[PDB]
Amino acid sequence: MRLARFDGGRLGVVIGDEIADITALTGADPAQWPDMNMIRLIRDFEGLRGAIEAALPGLARIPLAQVSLETPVPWPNKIIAYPVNYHAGFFLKPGSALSGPTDPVVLPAVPGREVHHESELAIIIGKTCRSVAREDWKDVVFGYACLLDMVVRGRVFRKAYDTFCPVGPWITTADAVNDPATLDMKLWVNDDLRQKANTRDLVLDIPGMIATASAVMTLQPGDIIATGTPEGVGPVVDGDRIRIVIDQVGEMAVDVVQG
Template identity: 55%
Template sequence: MHLFRFDGGRIGLTIDGASYDITEPLGIDLGAWPPVQMVALIADFEKRTQGITRHPRCRQIDMARVRLEVAIEWPNKLIAFPVNYVKHGEEMKSKSRADLSGFFLKANSSLSGPSDPIVLPEYPGREIHHECELGIVIGKKGRNVSREQAFEYIFGYACLIDVSLRGPEERVMRKSFDSFTPFGPWITTADEVPGPGSLQAKLWVNDELRQNANTRDLIVDIPGMIEVSSKVATLFPGDIIATGTPEGVGPIKRGDRVRIAIEHVGEMTVQVK
């Protein structure tokens, strides 16, 4: 299944090739603040969506006629693992790796959707780079989760671009500008993603293939990231983990098109402004 947000916070579901607007059947208040409707749905997904396509207020939609938005607008946490591929560490001449430095947090407000542009801030003489990453979505509350149990806590996966201003500032600052975490185009539920530890991930800029790698090459693998994260902070439904980027990062500029595709997960193209 694919779970997505569209057209002003409405919630959609794609199942067996058909897409549905499930906003009214769920009783979603589109004006509610904070906008945690998707997080609440993920926390109780099976119960709240059982038989939902038969609900009298459920309507089928044409995906070509909707505007997709960021799949999770307001997660509790956006966790990111830096330098989590050996070759990326080599190209960046990094003295650290994810198995040594752990993770950091990005601002939730950096999240943007597949229909939103990456908006570049004014930093003359500085490069801003794309980073192709798999995004993990947590499905249930967990603390001190073991490697063996880790996959039980995953709700699904999405494409994620970690946009980074290069320079001397703290990593959190350089990666937390608004629009610096394009995420989507939807959440693909975990049951639809065979072998998440061996997914091909690619990124293009203006049709030039820049990044092409496989999650099997992660330094800290998916169970390891959940284990490490949950030792420090309780994981909650809707939390997002950015798994790190492979080699091939490079600059983007206004007018560019950035396309990311991850096997079994999805594909999206975002504009740079």
């Protein structure tokens, strides 16, 4: 299932080239601030998924062309990021850096420095958990999304700028991904392929990243784990369009603007 936020915090299920609005069915309030509706939907999903599937046929459907998709989890408890982590410790990103699939990446005017793209697979946590065993990793994963880890090249603050963590365009629920350790990930800048890898080449694998992070911190529904980036990290400039594809997970493209 593909779960998305859109048009000011509405919740929807993406079906082909349309979105079905589940806001009213789930009792979500898109005016809620801070907006934690997706985190409650994630927490409660095994108790809501059957209801959503049963009601889906009667729900309002809107072409994706006519909505503005948003980042699916706007205020997570934390964003845990593993640097590098592909064959040729963790850090935190601020929730303020999150941006959606229709929002531009806004470059700071950083004299004499470049801003680089990093394509990553995001893990979305589904359960409150601590000290998860490798063998139990599937119990705590809600799903997956595409993530861009934008960075001023040179410090934690260089990954902290607003718009430096695009996440989207939806969450694909874990049941819909056969094996997330076999997925091809691609990133283009304009027409040119710049990064391409398969998650079979993760150094610290998905169960390892969950066991490690949860050994230190209690994880929460909605937490994002950025799993690393392959080779090909490079610069973006004003007017560029970054496209990321992760097979079985999603695709998004974002514009780059000079601030």
